Design a protein around this ligand. Sequence first.
Ligand SMILES: [Mg+2]
Lengths: 447, 448
Amino acid sequence: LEDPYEKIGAELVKEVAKKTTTTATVLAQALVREGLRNVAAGANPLGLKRGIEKAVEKVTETLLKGAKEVETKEQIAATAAISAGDQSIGDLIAEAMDKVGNEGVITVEESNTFGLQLELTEGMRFDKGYISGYFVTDPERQEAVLEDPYILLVSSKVSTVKDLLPLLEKVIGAGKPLLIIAEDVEGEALSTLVVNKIRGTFKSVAVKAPGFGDRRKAMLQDMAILTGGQVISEEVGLTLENADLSLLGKARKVVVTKDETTIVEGAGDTDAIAGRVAQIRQEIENSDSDYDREKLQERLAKLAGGVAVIKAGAATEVELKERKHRIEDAVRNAKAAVEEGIVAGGGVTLLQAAPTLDELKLEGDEATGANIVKVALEAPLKQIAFNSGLEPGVVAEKVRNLPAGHGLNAQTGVYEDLLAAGVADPVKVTRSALQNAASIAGLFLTT
Amino acid sequence: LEDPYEKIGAELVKEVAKKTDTTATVLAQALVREGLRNVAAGANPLGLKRGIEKAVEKVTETLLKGAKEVETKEQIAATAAISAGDQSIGDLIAEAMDKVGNEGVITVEESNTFGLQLELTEGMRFDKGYISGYFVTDPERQEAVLEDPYILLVSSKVSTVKDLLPLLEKVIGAGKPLLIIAEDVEGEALSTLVVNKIRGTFKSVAVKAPGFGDRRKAMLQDMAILTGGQVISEEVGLTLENADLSLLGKARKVVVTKDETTIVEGAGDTDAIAGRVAQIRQEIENSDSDYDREKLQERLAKLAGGVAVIKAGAATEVELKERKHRIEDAVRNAKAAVEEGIVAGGGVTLLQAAPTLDELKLEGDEATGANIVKVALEAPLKQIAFNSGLEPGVVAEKVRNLPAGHGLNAQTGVYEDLLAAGVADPVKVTRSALQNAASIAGLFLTTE
Ligand SMILES: [Mg+2]
């Protein structure tokens, strides 16, 4: 017996949570559900809202405090282990993470041998995707992939053709593909690119150069040095209309997604790349302004860290797929666990955070909004036990009474330390999930 | 044969000219002495003045009308190079106007490298200066300049001393200066900030946040993102007690004048910024009001625009100051050309304008007031002829006649096209000079 009016809300919250999950939705649905219930009893939608927010801030802290850290390769490997359901894969990720460090570029690649192989190379990644989604090549992943690409680096906009075709020709005359990173690519240069690309006459991609202004020119310089090319900036005697392939950097493979370009390989001497690396260590030392050291460490990281490449073997392209996926997922989990740490999954951490909300003194509407969150904190667990075909109220009461870290495991069915068991979660994820559920829920009780 | 009187008065005028704003001074003197003779011949002040005012208008629409427009990077470049006495400069500014766009912010600082530098960075200028002039650090330029500051955004009034202590404590702890932008900064809060600045204890500036109510609160948030800071509010974010330096935003430099605040190089995540600019473009499209719309789009033009910096090849001395104040003039002066156009430089475009006065209602005293104007229009060129040592009336008569758009030069001594010959003024400038003079003259007539 579910109230029609609540059901219609339920579905409006779900159809939203989609766009911005399973935890977050079930968690939102609960919040909104208790929301409408108290809004109907004459309660300020706003007061219930701010009250929720305070509750969520407080639970957040409590979750970040009571979070098991993940630092040793050994631990790290275990986290990735779970995320992929394979010890072999987690160890290879932990290896890679150790080599290039937790925050390093770790891509995964379709090897033709079989098994699982780790290789390191140079390259870097920046948060700038393709200009047009028409530059795409693997529709399912929504990525463009160039192979043995020439790299055009331009410190201005590109929109004419009169300066493009000189270069373009000389590049198709090599039967090589091309990545161009410029201030921007505007139509007549964007369309000549996207078009020749479908004609199949010319494969390529265009990406907005990262940053703004002068730092932007230094990051293009960076890329030239890490690619073996020279930045095209007519301001210093280097015409676009006049450029032999000599001015373009090369690499092994480029990969552009909706928001990040990855170059893999080089591309400039070990000398030059060392030179740049040092010079940047210099600026770092000779600066007393913290911003520039931030942005410098940043440039350094990409330039110095290089790229870890995980190689996977297979025979069905579908397996190659499922594999690439599984690994990629384990990476992002690994990285997230190394940042706020890790916590018992199963929705137990959340349901056992509820009693932290008594340390909170609020009055009326903001106090109810707090107690609403307190009830929602159990939704994820209760929801799981329901799919498990167990008794929601009943499981919420057999867990509300157990050691901090133990609850229902729907794999075995055996109430145990869920952390032990490898039912865990990166706490970033549990904290994100609550926060969104609480924005969504807030917005609802207000619009 | 100078008149001790007209002399004693031309002199008095020159001083009232050195007040705000020299073409105007010669104009104002010409209007006043001519205006005096006539007053000393019966003619009424109020009458002549009123007349001058109406006579100036006419000369205005006319000067606007005879305006060679400027759009292109060529033209624009050309203008600034004149007003700067360099063509590197001209270009460098025309360039600077290419990038940040035409009505964007273009800052000039004195650097220590040699080649005048164009750096683009994130940043912002808004229309509010220092709450108090005691924050001034360069007393010549009436400016407060702050290096590597920590910026504080507060959507409420700051008055209370105690409220800030826990934050100020932490900022003195870093040797960094602080720019505070609140609803206001008054009372013991204000004096405390000031006292400390005089002492040397602590380097700050306090500025009022722009606009009102909601719309102010939104711009604050804009400043927040552009800087990496978050707006301290008592409705979303937390109290001013137990605040962290991570809350503060930062930038390479803040310039606060009597009128304005520039934030150079905000320390914000370039993509955080981009994202917000997005949020605004959306708001614009969803906007139900053509008013709500123009506001949003200038907010947007501030974020996305950033700030052109120009560094002054130095090496090495007081020249770096002069050199700065010139580059600056060449900038407000190109921004000005574009906006209204250019005209016959020299003292010319003004002269040839007088023939536009006759189309008025030449009646009584106001008839004469206007007749005074047609006279002073000669003044500009007059003075110049007086320098290279010519015959005012002769040079003046000849030029008075030469086909619309030609006149004499200074280095050139050639009655040739002077626009082409490269000698010109922003209309606006020329229009302002006359308008000002008349306003001076305006006094000497009514008052003693
Ligand atoms: Mg300066």
